[PDB]
Design a protein around this nucleic acid. Structure first.
Lengths: 402, 355
DNA sequence: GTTTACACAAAAATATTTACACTGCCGTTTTCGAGATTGTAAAATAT
DNA sequence: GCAGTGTAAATATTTTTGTGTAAAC
DNA sequence: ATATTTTACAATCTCGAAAAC
């Protein structure tokens, strides 16, 4: 309190609105808000209709002002009862409060943020009832979160770059209702690295289970958003990726995603033999050449086949596709296989969808994944390290490309 | 007060502020009220802790308690309260607001209990807290029983720093002082002095090792890929019709899984003789026994309330937090069980005079 | 007279239930990425 | 088995609107 | 001439989540 005018106003308020004790101050703030809204509405009515309170009109008019209504509003202070009459001919639109609005839009964004951070619709209802006094149903949360569908439709069709050096495709499965039955559907997330060294999600796609055409529709969409050339594409073995990648971007060299390979093989090992097993596995892909990597593969397979025999079978079966990973440099392959690039997104999505399991509709799952995606990408404004050297090696490998 | 007609001398106080703050929308007035009243509310609340020598309370303090109930840190509560009022929340402030509910928790921990409870579970969770300026590890034990009416109200909470038989006996005697005479079933993980105090207080009470902790502690050793089959085998372990068939299924799964996880089934084979056999009760009770997701729900909530990495010093703050977290849920899962009549009939047939 | 104020049906526009068609077997410590507060001296300011 | 879920459809709950008359001027 | 503030300058400390025991 440094303003003398506002301090005199505060004194007039405390001596005028009968401030008594702690139980009375909240009711006094509520009635203060109500009376301020009443004064503003009376001013707006006298300015719009023009006729003052019992003022001798100069001309003979046929219109009048009469009515009685009670609008039980609610705001940040809590539910507030108020009442302001209307005009006779039912022609008066209050601008401070709309003709049917009863809430405060300053908290709608916070409701959206609460839904995005992981809280459920009923949990948001409980919290709002606890801290804000008034009740907001779960269907109100659903309407609030539906009110941002055009924002998602606009986000998924934004202008992209020209050439992306590395782009990963990651599949994550969830439970959704379709055609009246709950099933397990996979939503795919495309995460690319920009030539500036930045990292950001390109797009999200749900449905059209394991179709070669669907992948092309994704790739063509990438083209329609303005993509011309992809150098590296890391993706787990799926139905129509490898087929469609040659149909859309034949110059794109394709490699099987290594971040899923290292994670999927540790599913067979125990919770205690994970530090050592990873260490040896780390030497499998940090080998200088492909023959050294194959030899380390044989060594670790023979070492851990006694306890976990089915762990290295996937490596031995797919090593032919794992081969094109030893072409890239160490500083670039490290960026390729690092856990924070892909596993962080999956862990965050699982951490936000731990409560929500059975999404009623693909729209709800898309909305949830989009909100989680924005909440994570809001923190990826950092550049990569040693990006100049990586870009030099990339231009050396792919001449005339970047 | 049939109408909202007030003294018309407030129009000056309304108009001066509405013309100074340039209030063209409700947002302007809403952001102005907090700026004008935050310091006032802060300077008024800083005197409530001094008004006492050191009956509900104000609504703002109830809101702060509700915020502290969800498991929010002081910074989260500070942001949440600046979004409305605009002032900051200190450690002494939240400490006083939590201390103001000391009579309620002290009367709840001294609340008169029932007489005979058919089934009682006890779950222990350990945390690290600062006390008297030293960091230590204290264990809080929660006793949750189901009454003969079929309800599942929480019985009590007790914190200590010792797995000693003396403390356990003192807890049981405290429960006796609360007016309990007979407990029929006691579900508890293997601890140091459990069986000693159980035989000292209720020797006729049949005591069995809690199976929900056994399946959780045994599945911790298996891998993330060989967990579905291992779970299926354990399901065949505890869904067996008789106790000997269950013993045979346990031997089978042990001999099958000793090649990959030798130390996983060792606890089962080691403790099957002394506490494992729960197979006297019927399946209508055995299902509720091995599916009691309420204990794990409470434990998961307690883990979710651990946003404060180390709890605020002194045992009183952790006790307050655990009490409010337990009450906020138990006030809404006080509903009846299903097919409880059959279980009660089986219990009265098994325990004729209710021992 | 002039103008408002007000109880009541009737209509319009939201907020809350209801139903649904299913899902769900989980730690402790280390490290990390920032955020907040302030150490710390010293550079500018002044009682 | 008990506890959750996000939203389509369906109620339930206000607000607001037609007044025909009583009050404030 | 010294005492006071605030301010660069980070510097340290602290603190809320993913990662790894």
């Amino acid at each position: 309190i440094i303003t003398p005018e506002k301090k005199e106003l505060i004194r007039n308020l405390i001596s005028e609105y009968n401030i008594t004790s702690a139980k009375d101050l909240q009711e006094a703030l509520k009635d203060l808000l109500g009376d301020t809204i009443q004064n503003m509405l009376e001013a707006e009515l006298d300015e719009h209709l023009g006729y003052e309170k019992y003022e001798s009109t100069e001309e003979a008019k046929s219109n009048y002002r009469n009515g009685y209504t009670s609008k039980t509003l609610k705001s940040s202070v809590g539910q507030v009862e108020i009442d302001i009459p209307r005009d006779r001919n039912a022609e008066f639109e209050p601008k401070i409060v709309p003709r049917y609005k009863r809430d405060i839009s300053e908290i709608e964004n916070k409701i959206i943020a609460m839904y995005a951070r992981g809280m459920s619709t009923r949990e948001i209802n409980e919290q709002i009832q606890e801290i804000y006094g008034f009740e907001v149903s779960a269907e109100m949360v659903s309407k609030i979160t539906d009110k941002i569908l055009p924002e998602i439709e606009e986000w998924q069709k934004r202008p992209l770059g020209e050439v992306y050096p590395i782009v990963f495709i990651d599949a994550i499965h969830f439970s959704v209702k379709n055609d009246g039955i709950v099933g397990k559907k996979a939503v795919y997330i495309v995460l690319a690295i920009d030539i500036e060294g930045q990292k950001d999600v390109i797009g999200i796609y749900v449905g059209e289970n394991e179709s070669s055409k669907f992948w092309l529709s994704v790739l063509n969409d990438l083209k329609n958003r303005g993509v011309k050339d992809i150098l590296i594409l890391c993706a787990d073995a799926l139905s129509g990726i490898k087929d469609a990648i040659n149909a859309a971007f034949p110059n794109t060299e394709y490699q099987r995603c290594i971040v899923h390979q290292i994670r999927n093989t540790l599913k067979y090992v125990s919770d205690k033999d994970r530090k050592e097993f990873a260490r040896d596995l780390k030497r499998i892909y940090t080998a200088p050449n492909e023959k050294a990597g194959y030899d380390q593969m044989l060594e670790v397979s023979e070492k851990w086949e006694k306890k976990y025999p089915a762990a290295m079978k996937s490596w031995k079966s797919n090593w032919d596709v794992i081969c094109p990973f030893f072409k890239y440099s160490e500083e670039l392959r490290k960026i390729m296989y690092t856990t924070n690039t892909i596993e962080s997104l999956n862990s965050s999505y699982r951490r936000i969808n731990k409560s929500r399991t059975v999404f009623p509709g693909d729209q709800s799952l898309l909305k949830s994944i989009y909100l989680a995606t924005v909440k994570i990408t809001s923190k990826w404004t950092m550049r990569y390290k040693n990006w100049g050297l990586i870009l030099g090696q990339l231009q050396i490998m792919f001449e005339g490309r970047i």
